[PDB]
Amino acid sequence: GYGNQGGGYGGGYDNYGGGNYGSGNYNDFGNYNQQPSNYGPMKSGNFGGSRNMGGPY
Amino acid sequence: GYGNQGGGYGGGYDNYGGGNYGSGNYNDFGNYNQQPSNYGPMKSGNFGGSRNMGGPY
Amino acid sequence: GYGNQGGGYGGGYDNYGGGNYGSGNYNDFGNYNQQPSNYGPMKSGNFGGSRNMGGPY
Amino acid sequence: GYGNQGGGYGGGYDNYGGGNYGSGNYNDFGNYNQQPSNYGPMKSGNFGGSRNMGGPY
Amino acid sequence: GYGNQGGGYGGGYDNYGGGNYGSGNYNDFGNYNQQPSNYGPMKSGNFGGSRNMGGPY
């Protein structure tokens, strides 16, 4: 039984290439750029996992 | 039983390549750039795991 | 029984490549760059684990 | 019984490659860079483990 | 019984490669760099372990 009557199966997440993958924010400051900046804060939610908040049993 | 009536199965997370993977933020300051900066704080949520906050048993 | 009626199974997390993997933030200062800086604090949430905060038994 | 009615099973975390892995922050100062700096403090949450904060028994 | 009605099973954490692994912060000062610095303090949360803070028995 895979998470029946509940969270189930998160899935299959496979990365075979470079660059960013997931929930984290990605700042690529490029090529030959003159003074690039962000000034922006970054908050990235949770990655994967299994969480049960089910009601009374 | 895999997390039935509860959190279930987080899943399969496999990384076969470089670069960032997950929830952490990624700053790539590039190539031949003149004074690149961020000024942005970074907060990254949780990676994987199993959490139970279920009600009364 | 794998975390039935509770947290369940966190999952399978496998890293076969370089670069960052997880919840920590990644600063890559690049190639041939002129004075790259961050100025941004980094806080990274928890990695994996099993946590029970279930109600009364 | 693996963490049934509770925290469950944290999961499988396997690292077969270099680079960073986990919750610690990663500063890579790159290649041929002119005066790279961070100025950013780093705080990294917990890695793995099992924690019970369950209610009254 | 593995942490049933409680913390459960922390999991399997196996490192077969170099680089950083865990919750400690990683400063890699790179290759052929001109005066790289950090200026950033590093605080790293707990690694593994089992903790019980359960309510009244």
Task: Write out the two tokens for D41.
Answer: 């403090």
Portion 24-53 of B in contact with A at CB < 8 A: 24-53
| Deposited resolution, Å | 3.1
Residues making up chain A, counted from first to last: 57
Q: Which two tokens stand for residue D7?
A: 């925290």
Q: Which chains touch E (3 or more CB pairs under 8 A)?
A: C, D
- CB atoms C42 and D39 under 8 Å: no
Q: How far is CA E22 from CA B6, B17, C9, D14, E9, in A?
A: 28, 20, 20, 11, 18
B48–D8 C-beta distance less than 8 A: no
Residue A50 tokens, joined: 């299994």
CA distances from A41 to A23, A24, C39, E26 (A): 14, 12, 11, 22
Angle at B51 between CA D2 and CA C22, to 5 degrees: 105
Pairwise CB contact (< 8 Å): C57 & D54: yes
Say which amino acid occupies E26. Y
In B1-57, which ranges are E strands? 12-15, 26-28, 42-44, 50-52
CA dist., res. A16 & res. A34, Å (int): 32
Q: Which residue has the tokens 């790179």?
A: E30
CB hemisphere CA count around B57 (13 angstroms): 21
**C-beta of residue C53 within 8 angstroms of C-beta of residue D5:** no
Q: List, in sequence order, every beta strand (DSSP E) within chain D.
A: 12-15, 26-28, 42-44, 50-52
Q: How far is CA C52 from CA A46, B44, C57, D9, in A?
A: 18, 22, 12, 11
Residues of C in Cβ contact (< 8 Å) with A6: 8
Contact C39, D39 (CB under 8 A): yes
3-class secondary structure, B16: coil
Q: How far apart are the first and last CA of chain C?
A: 18
